[PDB]
Design a protein around this ligand. Structure first.
Ligand SMILES: NC(=O)c1ccc[n+]([C@@H]2O[C@H](COP(=O)([O-])OP(=O)(O)OC[C@H]3O[C@@H](n4cnc5c(N)ncnc54)[C@H](OP(=O)(O)O)[C@@H]3O)[C@@H](O)[C@H]2O)c1
Ligand SMILES: CC(=O)[C@H]1CC[C@H]2[C@@H]3CCC4=CC(=O)CC[C@]4(C)[C@H]3CC[C@]12C
Length: 325
């Protein structure tokens, strides 16, 4: 079915998305300059055809540098590359959407993005600062209006600036808001959420499937486990007994096992790695498959505990993690 040379799955709007991609978030202060660019280039050489980034990751220019260099040398045509960008909370005001996308296009120095998604359903105070916090370190929110922001996203697709529209960190309620929006033009084709064996997203996955929405699993390897923002109550996913046990059976690492798990269930995975060897390791998941019994035992590992809770925003009206799914 899926192979290293062909692993794109269809999107509801007629487009397709490579089932695996390279995540590009990396802690700014502790990341060498050019590391992201080198990684994207290595990923493209390894066979990746999907890159996931965000202006707020502060390396979107490196991502564009790498993509342009690979297109320039003839390694791939623009049409063979799939890039997903995101609209941060401080840019949800309708009039700000298009200018925000245009900036990303200018940073990448490309004509369009394959996918553009609302980064979080929560809106923050519009401005230069991506993390609005007053004197008391308190967070400066902003009234959200997903429907209105979505209409502005639709205009971007109508202008040909982006091929597919989607969302990230949206719960069932927030997804219905768009899906049932009066006079909806473009339905979201993807919802990027935390997904892995410890948080399988069983109910959100089935809901999305009912609406032909494809799920993209961010933090598919369980995150970098940075205590500054990651919930480490759960043990390291890649140290899991079953996952490592299964890895031995197929002579694959636990990481490869968890990635295969999600793609086999139709979930797009975007593992991040700026390490030459691990970039290629994560791509080696088409030369084997898991049995239904193993798939069930892996899914049974779900703990319903998120590595990415973002508790500091649990008070925001659009906080998505309060609801069951
Ligand atoms: N939309 C959202 O709200 C949201 C939130 C979080 C993340 N994301 C996106 O999702 C991407 C993926 O998630 P993430 O970066 O949080 O996490 P992740 O992909 O789950 O894990 C990354 C961590 O795993 C390491 N790693 C990679 N391959 C490995 C392997 N085979 N064995 C052992 N360790 C390995 C990486 O280190 P090395 O680099 O040294 O290999 C890094 O520390 C992001 O980079 C971003 O593009 C989106
Ligand atoms: C405020 C703060 O500490 C920052 C540092 C690391 C940041 C996170 C880095 C990863 C990330 C990627 C996204 O696409 C959405 C938001 C998140 C989940 C960021 C939310 C804000 C954080 C938690």
């Amino acid at each position: 079915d899926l192979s290293a040379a062909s692993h794109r799955i269809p999107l509801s709007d007629g487009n397709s998305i490579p089932i695996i991609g390279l995540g590009t978030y990396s802690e700014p202060k502790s990341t060498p300059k050019g590391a992201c660019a080198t990684s994207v280039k290595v990923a493209i050489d390894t066979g990746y055809r999907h890159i996931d980034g965000a202006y707020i990751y502060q390396n979107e220019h490196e991502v564009g540098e790498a993509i342009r260099e690979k297109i320039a040398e003839g390694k791939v045509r623009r049409e063979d590359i799939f890039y997903c960008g995101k609209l941060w909370a401080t840019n949800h005001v309708p009039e700000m959407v298009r200018p925000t996308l245009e900036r990303t296009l200018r940073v990448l120095q490309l004509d369009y993005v394959d996918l553009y998604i609302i980064e979080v359903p929560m809106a923050f105070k519009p401005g230069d600062e991506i993390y609005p916090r007053d004197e008391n370190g308190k967070w400066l929110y902003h009234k959200s209006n997903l429907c209105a922001t979505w209409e502005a996203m639709e205009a971007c697709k109508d202008a040909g600036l982006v091929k597919s529209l989607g969302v990230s960190n949206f719960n069932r309620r927030q997804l219905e808001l768009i899906l049932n929006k009066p006079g909806l033009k473009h339905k979201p084709v993807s919802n990027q959420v935390e997904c892995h064996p410890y948080f399988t997203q069983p109910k959100l996955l089935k809901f999305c499937q009912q609406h032909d929405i494809v799920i993209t699993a961010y933090s598919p390897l369980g995150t970098s486990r940075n205590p500054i923002w990651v919930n480490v109550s759960s043990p390291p996913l890649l140290k899991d007994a079953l996952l490592n046990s299964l890895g031995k059976r197929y002579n694959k690492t636990a990481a490869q096992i968890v990635l295969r798990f999600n793609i086999q269930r139709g979930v797009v995975v975007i593992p991040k790695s700026f390490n030459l060897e691990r970039i290629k390791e994560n791509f080696q998941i088409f030369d084997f498959s898991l049995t239904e019994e193993e798939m069930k035992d892996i899914e049974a590992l779900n703990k319903n505990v998120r590595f990415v809770e973002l508790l500091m925003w649990r008070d925001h009206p659009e906080y998505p993690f309060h609801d069951e799914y």
